[PDB]
A paper describes a structure:
To gain structural insights into the recognition of the ACE2 receptor and evasion from neutralizing antibodies by the [name].1.5 S protein, we performed cryo-electron microscopy (cryo-EM) analysis of both the [name].1.5 S ectodomain alone and the [name].1.5 S–ACE2 complex. We determine the structural basis for the interaction between human ACE2 and the S protein of [name].1.5, showing similar overall structures between the S proteins of [name].1 and [name].1.5. Our recent report showed that the S486P mutation in S is a determinant of enhanced affinity to human ACE26.
Although the overall structures of the closed-1 and closed-2 states were essentially the same in both protomers and trimers between the S proteins of [name].1 and [name].1.5, some differences were observed in the specific details. In addition, R567 and D571, which have no interaction in [name].1, form a salt bridge in XBB1.5. Another common feature is that the closed-1 cryo-EM map showed higher resolution and well-packed RBDs, while the closed-2 cryo-EM map showed relatively lower resolution in the RBDs than in the whole map, suggesting that the RBDs are mobile. By cryo-EM analysis, a structural comparison of the S proteins of [name].1 and [name].1.5 in closed-1 revealed a difference in the loop structure consisting of L828 to Q836 within the fusion peptide (residues 816–855). Despite a structural difference in the fusion peptide portion, which is essential for membrane fusion, the overall structures of [name].1 and [name].1.5 were highly similar.
Numbering used by the authors:
A (entry chain A): 753 to 1051
B (entry chain A): 903 to 1139
C (entry chain A): 554 to 622, 629 to 677, 689 to 802
Write the structure that this text describes.
Amino acid sequence: LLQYGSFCTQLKRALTGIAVEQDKNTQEVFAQVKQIYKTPPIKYFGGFNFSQILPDPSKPSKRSPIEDLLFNKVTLADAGFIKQYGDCLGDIAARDLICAQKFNGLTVLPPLLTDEMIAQYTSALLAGTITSGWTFGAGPALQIPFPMQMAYRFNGIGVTQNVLYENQKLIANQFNSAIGKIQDSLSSTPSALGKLQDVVNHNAQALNTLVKQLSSKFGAISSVLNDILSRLDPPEAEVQIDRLITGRLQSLQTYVTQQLIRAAEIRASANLAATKMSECVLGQSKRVDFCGKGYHLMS
Amino acid sequence: AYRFNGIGVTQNVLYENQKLIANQFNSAIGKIQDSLSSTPSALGKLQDVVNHNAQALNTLVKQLSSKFGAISSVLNDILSRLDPPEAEVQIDRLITGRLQSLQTYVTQQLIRAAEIRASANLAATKMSECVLGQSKRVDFCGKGYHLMSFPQSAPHGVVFLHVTYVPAQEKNFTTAPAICHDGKAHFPREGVFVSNGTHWFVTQRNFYEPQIITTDNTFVSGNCDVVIGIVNNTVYD
Amino acid sequence: ESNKKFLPFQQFGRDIADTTDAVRDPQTLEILDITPCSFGGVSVITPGTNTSNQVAVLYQGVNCTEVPVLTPTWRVYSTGSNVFQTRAGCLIGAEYVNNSYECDIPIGAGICASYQTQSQSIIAYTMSLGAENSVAYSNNSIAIPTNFTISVTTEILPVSMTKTSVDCTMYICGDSTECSNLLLQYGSFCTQLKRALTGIAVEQDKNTQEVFAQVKQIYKTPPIKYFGGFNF
Ligand SMILES: *[C@@H]1O[C@H](CO)[C@@H](O[C@@H]2O[C@H](CO)[C@@H](O)[C@H](O)[C@H]2NC(C)=O)[C@H](O)[C@H]1NC(C)=O
Ligand SMILES: *[C@@H]1O[C@H](CO)[C@@H](O[C@@H]2O[C@H](CO)[C@@H](O)[C@H](O)[C@H]2NC(C)=O)[C@H](O)[C@H]1NC(C)=O
Ligand SMILES: *[C@@H]1O[C@H](CO)[C@@H](O[C@@H]2O[C@H](CO)[C@@H](O)[C@H](O)[C@H]2NC(C)=O)[C@H](O)[C@H]1NC(C)=O
Ligand SMILES: *[C@@H]1O[C@H](CO)[C@@H](O[C@@H]2O[C@H](CO)[C@@H](O)[C@H](O)[C@H]2NC(C)=O)[C@H](O)[C@H]1NC(C)=O
Ligand SMILES: *[C@@H]1O[C@H](CO)[C@@H](O)[C@H](O)[C@H]1NC(C)=O
Ligand SMILES: *[C@@H]1O[C@H](CO)[C@@H](O)[C@H](O)[C@H]1NC(C)=O
Ligand SMILES: *[C@@H]1O[C@H](CO)[C@@H](O)[C@H](O)[C@H]1NC(C)=O
Ligand SMILES: *[C@@H]1O[C@H](CO)[C@@H](O)[C@H](O)[C@H]1NC(C)=O
Ligand SMILES: *[C@@H]1O[C@H](CO)[C@@H](O)[C@H](O)[C@H]1NC(C)=O
Ligand SMILES: *[C@@H]1O[C@H](CO)[C@@H](O)[C@H](O)[C@H]1NC(C)=O
């Protein structure tokens, strides 16, 4: 193989580029603000109830109930684990596909940002948008009572503020009911989180195909190098080894190309998500059907 | 003044602070050259394209020294050291290897071209929206309230200079949603009620400028029994 | 020793990748299982060579106990120097501290490394998300600014790249005729390559034209440059 060029340097470079791009995407999406705001201890906002989206201090990981349901709904499977070789050598007689992947030179790297840091970023964004409206997204944060912020947002869509000031309780009740229905709507439908499951399914399928490809003969007497080496003299052995080498190289090339295309698609999706975070959360958008159906109020 | 009215600030603010705004703009423009020159890694995106192209071409050239399983990597030596019928089988390996290298190079170039096209489309949209007009989209033409943009050309790229407005030196105040007077509720037209401790005024949101509460800048539209937190005072006519 | 329940007529065991992992000893009929011995990857963390020559070594995905200390001939200290365990594996040659700074060199799950004067040394820490803040929220209080600042920022965007062309015959066969004749019967791959390269070359110019040709009138500035005190 040493005399076939430098294809594998190119493969390593492409894989490293994709790995760096993933962390860049996450950092771009989830790091809009540089100040870690925290909610006031007393939770009274004119009748609006935010308990379903604020972090829960009772649980150890400090996640909102909706975040808990979202994390329980999706199966993660592959992740980074230290001493994973020890678990593989434990040999409980249940040889999973992960150990087979590891023993053939395929590894999975952990992300730079943990889940707790992302949860902290989300909590800071929520506290900022609750306590300051949209001022913290364009300079220093300026406090303002929540009903006055809602009156400003209603003026933003062409409705006078006395409409809000005379229907505060009904609007608060409607908002509370709409927030409450979200958990039931998410839990009842099992196919809601298809997009997030598709990524895991695609990665697992690609890795499994790459591992299974090692059993092909590609026109040789056998698919095992040791058997070929023991059953033949060398000069008849190079011609048998060459076919296997070429087949495995082709499989690696195909895998890398597919990974590159998927990475490009994921980058486009991440850019869209970052734009939506910038425009719908840190301010009020006048673009039609960009931040929901109807006249956008807040995200 | 038109651009300041576009972000919700009255034009008399500009007309009374023209010299200070001009000085601030001049200083901000002057700092740009020092900021660009001091940092050596600012123009990484433009250098990456050249580096990638040079690396790809160098790899393609260096790939010609591989044997790919033949006796030699030189066609003339193979032709001179062997009869033809033994020579086609040696030439075929080299041909296949070089073809594979060309295929890989072309595929990588296509992917890079797609990425560059996406970047160029984004740049064209930014040029259309931030330079030829004033944008209300948050964080699209800089950080803060966008005022105006200027374009510049660079090797294989464009550089946008965004000029924006940032508030500073905030102060605390006591506020109320409405004012009760003669059994009627009054709401501000454009602004918010503010109290310095003793008296009440109305001011615009993005700049402190108190004014006497009159019937000219308020409307009634309701009674004084529904609004929560109403405060009763006097309204001048 | 293997716990697999081999049938009396079975002599070998295979896996998904078609590799033998269970064997029966020819002399004593006992079932044994085979596992490859330890292996892994090594990463090197270093600042620029213009600064120092000290390095740190990260063994990836390996519990730092039963450390290999081998295929690599060079030996790290493996002792004396600080040894730390991260979710990415083991780190050797860097000291862990309580202080949190901005990330300099990424390592793994929330762990970064830096070169600090402390005697210069390499330290590892947990990255900091940002400075703490807490706005005073009240339901009858507001905050209003009293001054402003004019800010100028920059943004850089690539537009086009290099246009290249390749000749198949000269690259593959040079000036030889036998090689050209042999290549003539391999199809029309090179026509496709030429078409793709030409398409990319045209697309580059299209991108530049789309970006830089918004207006069709060539305006020029007046000779006298006075714009109310603004300096351009
Ligand atoms: C905000 O909503 C939550 C849940 O929607 C309320 O918590 C409920 O409180 C009642 C009475 O204390 C309990 O019987 C329920 O079991 C609680 N539900 C949950 C999920 O904890 C909370 O009381 C609401 N906020 C206010 C101020 O009433
Ligand atoms: C709040 O604003 C009112 C309105 O200007 C201030 O009242 C004035 O105070 C100055 C100096 O104290 C007097 O010269 C004026 O005659 C007052 N105006 C009126 C209509 O009486 C008041 O002092 C301000 N309070 C604070 C704490 O700043
Ligand atoms: C608003 O900010 C500007 C700039 O920070 C202030 O102008 C400065 O005023 C001080 C006080 O004399 C001068 O020493 C500086 O030279 C001024 N800066 C410039 C650029 O001219 C201005 O005073 C502030 N306004 C208020 C009401 O505080
Ligand atoms: C606009 O700015 C430029 C540079 O910032 C000014 O040019 C400077 O003028 C002074 C006095 O004539 C010279 O001492 C400097 O050497 C000049 N700098 C440069 C880079 O040429 C220019 O004067 C300013 N415009 C006005 C109308 O004052
Ligand atoms: C406004 O009040 C808060 C708390 O009451 C305080 O932290 C802040 O410094 C005050 N701002 C000014 C400008 O006095
Ligand atoms: C003015 O407001 C106070 C506080 O709400 C209230 O007690 C008082 O009755 C009001 N004045 C009149 C004339 O109703
Ligand atoms: C093979 O011979 C050895 C003696 O060296 C003996 O211990 C063993 O039981 C024999 N096994 C069989 C299957 O005959
Ligand atoms: C490393 O190995 C030891 C011994 O088996 C084990 O006790 C320890 O838990 C392992 N480290 C981790 C992080 O699990
Ligand atoms: C870091 O902080 C923890 C807090 O409990 C402390 O136990 C530990 O000793 C500190 N690190 C060092 C090196 O002292
Ligand atoms: C909100 O207003 C109510 C008036 O009913 C008051 O009792 C409460 O203290 C206010 N909240 C805060 C945080 O001061």
